[PDB]
Ligand binder design. Structure first.
Ligand SMILES: Nc1nc2c(ncn2[C@H]2C[C@H](O)[C@@H](COP(=O)(O)NP(=O)(O)OP(=O)(O)O)O2)c(=O)[nH]1
Ligand SMILES: [Mg+2]
Ligand SMILES: [Mg+2]
Length: 756
DNA sequence: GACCACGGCCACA
DNA sequence: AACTGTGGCCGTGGTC
């Protein structure tokens, strides 16, 4: 099973290393035969005689075109003659590419910026994370001495905890009487002992929580301050820090550094992404949090240290369990994209799509288009229409059926051969013309994107089929995650065509797809209304809710089945309407905001404040109980009493402030914020206090009784002292709970004043 | 002060 | 955060 790949430089030549695990043994395959290259397009063949002659310089050394080779590839679906230019070292390409492009005899160059090891993975047709081989994992966490105001990593590391299949252990340089703590003399000895533990256990995976942006950099600063070689890598190297956009990432050669934080943030949506909250969400059992002030006082005074040891041990244990749960799942992403687990765990969706498309293009000998330059990026700053959405018939309805298409946009792409290589293709005999926008697509030869999307949807349907017969529930989870991957990947492949910095960009294709979707959905609505007597309550982009005004549930279901058979006979290609749920009742507030109740009593809420993180828990809970009173038995009076009781509880300062916290995320650097909201104000005060604040952190604040501007009277919830603090009950009454319940209870004649 | 455009956040498909 | 478009909704400023 291929773990990863890189390359070293041996006597000026590239040597690919393939790190793998075969028969329970870690092996390193070496390859000195892979030659770096990129493609060039000339207007005349004989011009190559001069193309071989352009040289450049790297670090005093001269860089020359090693060898050239004429090759036939497929650009925009059409055969074309390109020149493969080979080089000695990959680092030659960034230094000579421009000099090649400046030449008048060349039109353009292609596939010049792809990294060497990943190009080796693609060209050799290798897929990592493949096989039944089980890896050994080791999770670890650290405890730090934090005073507010210091710089990063000034204080030493107090405890280093690790965990695996054998249990959890803490290492510390102060005496704690516990069966899982190992006491050493100094911090240096503790770090060295952790290194010895890693070297002896030799895990294939090192599991951390946000180790990409804290634990590893902290250990690096301390290791250099005390003169320790942080030789965690299986080849004796130390963690390599790399850029990951605005954040950082940490590699450990020969191993896989699995940082859970981006995986969890990208997989599950939570109000906060603390280790305690993530663990309680994934496993249901709570985890006690010990804050930095407690451990700082416990270290400086030497008391209550067993509590900090417990916190560190539990940290290591829960990160190990989360790694065990999430790693086999991300291995499926690694197999799907064809890149290393380390890469796919941290890479954005767009880069995942680009790697998948690059691998597919290599498989079909399709010359990959280049990323746009600045002027071309400027041209692509266009605007096209999106999906159709109607103003909902606001209010409460009964006996509702939701009908929606199966993978609307990919099915459109497949059915009409929507692809950049098929758009306005001269000379074909069968065309498909998009509504409104009028773009034509040839259907003689299947397009690149339609082919990939068809394979993907076929695989997803096979996975959903096997899920029904799946016995082993761990496998059920596996195939569920895999089909979710395929779904996200297909939707992102559609979105790729309308992305400015995308290689296979095609605004015409994307707007054609969305016009098709609008046409098909409005057609289905018109047909279900005019010919089956339905009334469409609400309709988003790929489906709608409908009902027979005044009819039995069975009648609505039967007529919906009829309409499905009819409209699916009328629908072409891969386009199919599906019955995806009957609901006893449903309250629709506005576009993207509704709630439905089915037959067994399960409430599905969409868009409402109950599902939003930036709303207070008291408001969410009040709206939830109100919606339950509405949807379970239609007890409007019960809901009005709920809101009156909750507002009286708020007025008398009787509600716990924990239910009063608003969580909002900062998305940019505080310098670049033009409008400063309450969370912005709290973040700016925190940064003024010398607290690390970066794009990604979540500010959790409470509004206090005070002077106007909410941001002036809002403080982080950790600084809330009930003795000297009183939350603004009027704020959370008149502007959190009441507005949340009013948009619902107005449909029964209640104004805000009938609720306080 | 009443009112209103609008960064800014998160959600839905 | 780092494929897209559509939408609701708030806290705040600034101009009448
Ligand atoms: N660029 C982009 N477009 C999207 C996304 N989600 C939806 N679209 C658009 C394009 C999609 O064609 C359309 C439908 O989205 P689904 O509700 O996901 N339909 P499906 O049948 O795949 O879900 P299921 O199989 O679970 O029932 O929404 C997204 O995340 N990104
Ligand atoms: Mg569907
Ligand atoms: Mg849907």
């Amino acid at each position: 099973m291929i773990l990863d790949t890189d390359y070293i430089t041996e006597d000026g030549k590239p040597v690919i290393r393939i790190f793998k695990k075969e028969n329970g043994e870690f092996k390193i395959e070496y390859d000195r035969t892979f030659e770096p290259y990129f493609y060039a397009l000339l207007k005349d063949d004989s011009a190559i005689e001069e193309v071989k002659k352009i040289t450049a310089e790297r670090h005093g050394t001269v860089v020359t075109v090693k060898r050239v080779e004429k090759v036939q590839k497929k650009f925009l679906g059409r055969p074309v003659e390109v020149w493969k230019l080979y080089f000695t070292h990959p680092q030659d390409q960034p230094a000579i590419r421009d000099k090649i492009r400046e030449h008048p005899a060349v039109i353009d160059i292609y596939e010049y910026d792809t990294p060497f090891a990943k190009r080796y993975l693609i060209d050799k047709g290798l897929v990592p994370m493949e096989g039944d081989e089980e890896l050994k994992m080791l999770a670890f966490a650290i405890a730090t001495l934090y005073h507010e105001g210091e710089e990063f990593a000034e204080g030493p590391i107090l405890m280093i905890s690790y965990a695996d299949e054998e249990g959890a252990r803490v290492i510390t340089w102060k005496n704690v009487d516990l069966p899982y703590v190992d006491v050493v003399s100094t911090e240096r000895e503790m770090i060295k002992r952790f290194l010895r533990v890693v070297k002896e256990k030799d895990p294939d995976v090192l599991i951390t929580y946000n180790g990409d942006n804290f634990d590893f950099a902290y250990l690096k600063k301390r290791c250099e301050k005390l003169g320790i070689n942080f030789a965690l890598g299986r080849d004796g190297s130390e963690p390599k820090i790399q850029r990951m956009g605005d954040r950082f990432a940490v590699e450990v050669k020969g191993r896989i550094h699995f940082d859970l934080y981006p995986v969890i943030r990208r997989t599950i949506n939570l109000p906060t992404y603390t280790l305690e909250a993530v663990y309680e969400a994934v496993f249901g059992q709570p985890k006690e949090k010990v804050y930095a002030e407690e451990i700082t006082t416990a270290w400086e005074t030497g008391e209550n240290l067993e509590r900090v040891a417990r916190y560190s041990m539990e940290d290591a244990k829960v990160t190990y369990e989360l790694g065990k749960e999430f790693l086999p799942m991300e291995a499926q992403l690694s197999r799907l994209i064809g890149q290393s687990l380390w890469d796919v765990s941290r890479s954005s969706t767009g880069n995942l799509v680009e790697w998948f498309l690059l691998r597919k293009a290599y498989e079909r000998n399709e010359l990959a288009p280049n990323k746009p330059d600045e002027k071309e990026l400027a041209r692509r700053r266009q605007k096209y229409e999106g999906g159709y959405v109607k103003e909902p018939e606001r209010g409460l309805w009964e006996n509702i059926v939701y009908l929606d298409f199966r993978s609307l946009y990919p099915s459109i792409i497949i059915t009409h051969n929507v692809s950049p290589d098929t758009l306005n293709r001269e000379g074909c005999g069968e065309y498909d013309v998009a509504p409104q926008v009028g773009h034509r697509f040839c259907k003689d030869l299947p397009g690149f994107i339609p082919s990939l999307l068809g394979d993907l949807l076929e695989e997803r349907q096979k996975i959903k089929k096997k899920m029904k017969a799946t016995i082993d529930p761990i496998e059920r989870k596996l195939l569920d995650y895999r089909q979710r991957l395929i779904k996200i990947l297909a939707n992102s492949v559609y979105g790729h065509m309308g992305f400015e910095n995308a290689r296979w960009y095609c605004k015409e294709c994307a707007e054609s797809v969305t016009a098709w979707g609008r046409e098909y959905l409005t057609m289905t609505i018109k047909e279900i209304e005019e010919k089956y007597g339905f009334k469409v309550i609400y309709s988003d982009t790929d489906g709608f809710f409908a009902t027979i005004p005044g009819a039995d549930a069975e009648t609505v279901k039967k007529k919906a089945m009829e309409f499905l058979k009819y409209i699916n006979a009328k629908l072409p290609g891969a386009l199919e309407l599906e019955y995806e749920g009957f609901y006893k009742r449903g309250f629709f507030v506005t576009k993207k905001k509704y709630a439905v109740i089915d037959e067994e009593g399960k409430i599905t809420t969409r868009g409402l404040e109950i599902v939003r993180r930036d709303w207070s828990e008291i408001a969410k809970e009040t709206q939830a109980r109100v919606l339950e009173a509405l949807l379970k038995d239609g007890d409007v009076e019960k809901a009005v009493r709920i809101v009156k009781e909750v507002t009286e509880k708020l007025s008398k300062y009787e509600v716990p402030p924990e239910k009063l916290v608003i969580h909002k995320q900062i998305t940019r650097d505080l310098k670049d914020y033009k409008a400063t909201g309450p969370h912005v104000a709290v973040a700016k005060r925190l940064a003024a206090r010398g607290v690390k604040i970066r794009p990604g952190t979540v500010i959790s604040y409470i509004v206090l009784k005070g002077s106007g501007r909410i941001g002036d009277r809002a403080i982080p919830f950790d600084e809330f002292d009930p003795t000297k603090h009183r939350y603004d009950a009027e704020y959370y009454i008149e502007k959190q709970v009441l507005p949340a319940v009013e948009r619902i209870l107005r449909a029964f004649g209640y104004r805000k004043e009938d609720l306080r």
